[PDB]
ATP-citrate synthase
Amino acid sequence: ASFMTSICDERGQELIYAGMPITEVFKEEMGIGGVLGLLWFQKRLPKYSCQFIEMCLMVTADHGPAVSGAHNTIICARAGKDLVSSLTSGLLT
Amino acid sequence: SAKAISEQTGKELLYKFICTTSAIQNRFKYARVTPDTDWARLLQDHPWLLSQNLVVKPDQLIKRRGKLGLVGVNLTLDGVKSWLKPRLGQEATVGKATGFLKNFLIEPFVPHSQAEEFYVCIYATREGDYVLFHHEGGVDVGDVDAKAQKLLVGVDEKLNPEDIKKHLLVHAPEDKKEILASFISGLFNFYEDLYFTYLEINPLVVTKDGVYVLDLAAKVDATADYICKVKWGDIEFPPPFGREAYPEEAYIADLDAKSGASLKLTLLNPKGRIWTMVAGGGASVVYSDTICDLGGVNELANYGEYSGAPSEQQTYDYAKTILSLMTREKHPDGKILIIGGSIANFTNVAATFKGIVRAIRDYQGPLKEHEVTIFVRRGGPNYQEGLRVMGEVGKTTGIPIHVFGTETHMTAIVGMALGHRPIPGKSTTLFSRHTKAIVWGMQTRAVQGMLDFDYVCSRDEPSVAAMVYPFTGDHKQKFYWGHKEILIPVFKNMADAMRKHPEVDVLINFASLRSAYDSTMETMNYAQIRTIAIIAEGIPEALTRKLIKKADQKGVTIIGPATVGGIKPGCFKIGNTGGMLDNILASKLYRPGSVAYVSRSGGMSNELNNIISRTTDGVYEGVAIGGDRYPGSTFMDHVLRYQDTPGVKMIVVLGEIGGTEEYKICRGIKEGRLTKPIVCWCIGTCATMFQASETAVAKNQALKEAGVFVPRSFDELGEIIQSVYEDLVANGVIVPAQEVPPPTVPMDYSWARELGLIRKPASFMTSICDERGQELIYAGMPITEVFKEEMGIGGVLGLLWFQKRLPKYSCQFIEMCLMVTADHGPAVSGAHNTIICARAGKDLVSSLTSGLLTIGDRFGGALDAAAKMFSKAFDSGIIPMEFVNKMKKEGKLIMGIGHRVKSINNPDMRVQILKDYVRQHFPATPLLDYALEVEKITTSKKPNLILNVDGLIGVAFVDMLRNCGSFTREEADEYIDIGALNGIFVLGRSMGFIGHYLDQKRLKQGLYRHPWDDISYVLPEHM
Amino acid sequence: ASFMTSICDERGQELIYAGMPITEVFKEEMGIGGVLGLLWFQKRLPKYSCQFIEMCLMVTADHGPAVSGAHNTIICARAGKDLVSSLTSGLLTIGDRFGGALDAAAKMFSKAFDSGIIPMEFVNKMKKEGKLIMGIGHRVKSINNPDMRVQILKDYVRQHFPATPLLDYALEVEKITTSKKPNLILNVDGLIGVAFVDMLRNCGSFTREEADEYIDIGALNGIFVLGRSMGFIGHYLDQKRLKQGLYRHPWDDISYVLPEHM
Ligand SMILES: COC(=O)c1cc(Cl)c(O)c(S(=O)(=O)Nc2cc(-c3ccccc3)c(F)cc2F)c1
Ligand SMILES: Nc1ncnc2c1ncn2[C@@H]1O[C@H](COP(=O)(O)OP(=O)(O)O)[C@@H](O)[C@H]1O
C-alpha cells in the first residue's frame, strides 16, 4: 500500500474516527474539543481538556483586522475572489 | 578482458611513466605514419629524421615482424619513403589472415652487437606475476618459456633487487648486471602502477651509451580504467591482424560504448543461410558449437554475445543491424535465423520482446522475399505475451516462424534447422537449511527472491538476516515472508550488522565493480563470514588476486566474481539464480534431488537447471563459479565438496575453453580421488573452426579418455545425463523423493505486470512531458533539439502549454507579453500582499502565493475578459457601432478599453511597442484591426478610453491563435475558453512578485500591522 | 512612508524598472533573461548571463507529471478549480524535499569553497559527519551516460563565462565521488546552484559580500519556482483540455491503521 493513514475510515456502514464510530461521538458529548483530540492525536481526551481546547479556539479567533493575516484576507476579499482564496491568502502569513 | 595495446602507445606510456636511476636513451623519438601522412608536418615535428638512419616497422599487433621481411632497417628518409612505396595501402598474407598495412612506425636505428640483445617478459598468473629474463634475444630466440630465467613474484609483494642480482642475472655479463637490475626493478613498478598483464620487450639493448627499447608488446586490463585513466590518458586498443571491420561492427561496438550492456558482433560470412540472435555470453558459444558440428559450418554468418539486459531501443538497434544484414540479396536456399539462449538475470523480459518484434514488423516486405525461416525458443519465464505477439506477427506478415518452448533442448532447434528431425580453514557444507545471509548493497528484488524461495522451501526462518548499505541512514526495510510482512534491518557500517547478528555465515556482495574489492576486504577481517559471493563483473584482475590471496590466508570460500551465484534447493538460493519463482515451480527447484552441476558461465545455470530438471529428480546444488579469468574457487574445490557430500549422487561439470582447470579432473580420477559418476562437456569446440592442449576439443577428448562420461557433442548432453540416471536408478543406488506440492505465494505486481498477466487501466493521462528514457522530451521534441535550435522560453512555453510548436514571430511575441506584464507596481493588490507576507518573515513560495491568490475577477483578470468580449463580438458579425451601442444599452463596461490617465494625445508606450510588433510580424491581424476601430469610435467621446495592455494582449493572443501556422479555429477557441490567456498574466507577474519578495527580504524590514488611523470600526452595540 | 519598494515605478509617462524605462528595455534586446535580472537584482546583466538564466528556465520547466508538485496540480485541476488555484496547489510543494535541492547545493559548495577545503577532506567529512552531498547523485545515469541537460548547461558555462571557480571545484568532486559509484553525478539541481554562485561572483557588476546575499535570501530557490511554473500551468491547461473528472484515490493503495477502542 502506497499511503498509510491512521485517522479515519471511509468504507463500512458508519464513518469511524480514530477508534470511535460517529454515532458514539454524538451518543456521548464529545464536542468539537473532543473530535479535535480524536482526529489529531488519535488519543481520546477527557472532559476538562476537551473544554480547554475549545477555550483555546474561542480565544485565538480574532485579535483584529489591522493584523497581517487579516489584512491580506481583507485585500484578497476586496479583490473579488472566493472564500478559499481569501482565507488562504491570509493563512500563508 | 585483457586487451592489447599498440607498440607506439605502449612505448609512450613507458617513456612517460617509467622512473629509474639509470637513464633511458631515445625518449619520445618515434614517428607514426598513416596514408594521411603530412610529411611536412612530421618533418617539422622531428628534425632528427634528417640526421641518422631509421628503422621502419608496422604497429598492428603483428607477431614475428623480423621474419616476414617487414622491418625496414638502417635507412635514411628517402630510403624509408621508398620502402614505404610498395607497402602502405597494400596487402600482406600474414600467417593465416590477410589485411591492409595501414599504420607504420619510424624509430631511430642505434647500432648494437649480438650479445647486447636481451629478453624481458612480465605476465600475470593466478599465483602472481612472473619475470622472465634471457641473455640472448632477437628473432632467433625460439621457445623462450621453458628456456629462460623465471622468477615468481607473489601476489601483493615487492621485488627485491638483490634477488634479481642473485637469480635473474646469473648468466648475464658482469659489467652489464647493475644497470639491468636498475631497469627491471623499475619496470615491474611500472608494471604494477598501470595494471598491465603482459609486457614483453624483445630485444632489449644495453650498449655503453645506455638503455633504449626497441620493441614492445603489451596487454592491459581494460576493466581497470577507473584507477588508471589519468595515467592512461587516451588509450586505443587495436584489433587482431585480419580483414577490415565493417562499419556495421563499428555501429554495434558503439552500442557497447554509451550503454551499460555488452554486445559485440563478429560476422565472418555475410552470404550464409545460418544467422544468430543469441542472448547470453555462454549460449552463443553453444550454438556456434552445434551449428558447426552439424556440418552447416560453411553457412554460419556471425556469433555475438549479448548480456547485461540493455534497453528495448538498443536491442532494437542490434536487431535492425542484423536484419539489415539479412535482406541485402537472395540466396535460393533460404536463411535460417536462430533466436534464443540463456540469461540468469531476467529483468527486461517485457522490453526485449518489444524490440525484436518491432524489428521484424518493420521489415515484412524484404524478409519474405529473402525467404527467412526463423526459429525462436524461449527460456526462463513463461512470457506468454511475447510468444503470442510472435505467433500473430508470423501470421500477419507471412514469415515462417516456429516459436518453441522450454520442452525442446537449447540445441534441439539446430537439428530442426539443418534437416535432421521434423517439426512438431576450508569447509565442505557451505549452505544448510539454517543458513543466514547478509546482502550487501540494496537489491530488494533479489532479497524478495530470496525470501519467497525460502517460503516455498517450507523453511522455518528467512535467509536474509540483515542488509548492509553504507550510503544511506540506518533503518529497516519491509518485505514479504509469505503472506505476513516482516522487517529486515538495513545498516550503514558493518560492525552494527556483525555485532547484532552472530548467526550469519554467508555474505552476498551486490556491489558495483568499483566497490567490490573494498567491501570484500572490509568483510574478510571478520570471523563468522565463511562464504562470500561476488556478483559484479569487470573487477580488474590485479584486485581479484588480492582477494584470492587473503581468501587463502583466511579460508573464506569465494564463489565469483562474474557469477550470478549458486542455488541449493530446499536450503538456500543466491542472488537471482534460477530466476523468479515462475521458473522455480516449473523446474521443480523447491526440493532436493541427487544431481549436482558446476559451470564456468553463469548464464548457463538456467539451462542446466532446465536439462537436469527434465531428466532427473532434481538438482542438489549447482554453482556458477563465474566468467572471469581468476575465479574465487575453480571446478576442483566444489568438486571436492561434492565428493565429500552424502546427498550428492552424480556430478555434472560445464567447462569452457581456456586454462588447465579441466585436466585436474583427469588427475583427480586417475589418482582415484574423485569417485562419483561425472558427466562433463566444455563449450567451444568449433573455436578453431574460424596453446594446443587448452583447446576445447582436446580437453573434451582427454576427459573422455580418463573416465568422464562425455557425450559426443552438446546435443547429447540431456541423453547422456538421462542414460546415467537410469542406470543409477536400476541398481538400487538412488531412492527418489516422493514429490509433494509446495506452499504458494502470490506473484509480485511489478513482475506480473511485465509478463502481461494483469490488466488495469492508467489513472492519469498526461500529454506534455516524458520523464523516463535517455533524454527528457517535451510535447514532441527532446531537449537537445530544443537547445539545438533556438526555441527560447517563448518556444518552450508554446511547446508545453499548447503542445503545438510555434514559429519565431510569435515565439518572440509571447516573450514580449511576459516582459510587459512583469510589474505594474508595488501599490497593486497582489504586490501589496506579497510585500506583507514577505515582511512577515516567511518563504519565497509562501510570499509569491499570498500575492498569486489575488489574481482573479477584479485584479489581473482583465485579459481573459477582453478576449471573451472582442472575440465573442467578432464572430456574431457586429460592426463596432452596434457593439458600442449595446455596451451602452445593456450597460456594461468594455473589458479591454479604458485607462486612468492617458489619451490619444499620449498613449501607453507599452501598447505602442506591442502594437508595432504585432503589425510588423503577424501575417494577418483580424480582431485587432477590429478593436482599433473600437478605440476611435469610443475615444471620440472621452479621450481616456483606450484599449489597455490588458486589452491588447487578450486581443493579440486571439489573433495569434487564429492566425498562427498550426491551429484551427475550433481548437483555438478552446485555449481561450480554458484560460491560457489568463495564465499568461500569472507567469508574467510572478517574475515581479519574486522580485518584491526578494527585494524586501534584502531591505531588512519588520512585521507589518496596519494603522488604526485607516480603519473605521462599526460594531453593533449590544453588550 | 510605510513601505519602501525598490524595483518599479508606477507613475509618470513610462513604466520604469530598476533603472531602466521600458522603451529602453525593448529598444535594446533585454529579453526575459534581462528583465529577470533587472527586477530581482536591480543590477543590469550582460548578455552571456542573460542568455544563461533563460537556459535555467528552459531546463527546469518540467521534469514530469509523476512528480509531487505536478501530481497535486493534476489533482486540483481535475477537481474543477481555477488556474491560480491549480498552479498554487502544486507550488506549495516546493520546499525542503522537492525542488529545494538548488539552494542546498549552493549553500554547500559555496560554503565549502570559502573555508579552503580541497575536495578530499570535503568528501571525507561528508562521509564522517554523515550527510549526503546536496548537488551530487542521480537515479540512473553515470559517467558513461550523463544527463544531456547537464551537458548543455556545462558547455554553455564553459563557452561564455570569463572565469568559473566553484564549478571547476565541483567537477573535481564529481570525479572523486564517482570513482566509487558510477551514478554519483552532480545533477542539474546541483549545477544550476553552482553556476549561479559562479555567475553572481564573476558577473561584471556585483561584489562577493553582496553576491552572498542573493544566495542566502533564496533567489536561487526562486529560479526553480519561475522555471517550473511554466510546467504547472501546462499541466493545469492540458488536463482542463483533456476533460477528466474528479479524482479520488483508490482504497487499494491505503493501509488503514486504527487503534481499536470503540
Ligand atoms: C535478455 O533476454 C531476455 O529478456 C530473454 C527473455 C526470455 Cl523469456 C528468454 O527466453 C530469453 S532466451 O535467451 O531464453 N530466448 C530468447 C532470446 C531472445 C533475444 C532477446 C534479445 C536479443 C537476442 C535474443 C528473444 F528475442 C526471444 C527468445 F525466446 C531471453
Ligand atoms: N630500431 C631498431 N634498431 C635495430 N634493429 C631493429 C630495430 N627495430 C627492429 N629491429 C630488428 O627487428 C627485430 C624486432 O622485430 P620483432 O617484432 O622483435 O621480431 P619478433 O616478433 O620475431 O621477435 C629485432 O630482431 C631487431 O633486430
User: Anything to note?
Assistant: Chain A touches chain C at residues 1-7, 9-11, 16, 18-21, 24, 42, 44, 82, 84-85, 88 (CB under 8 Å).
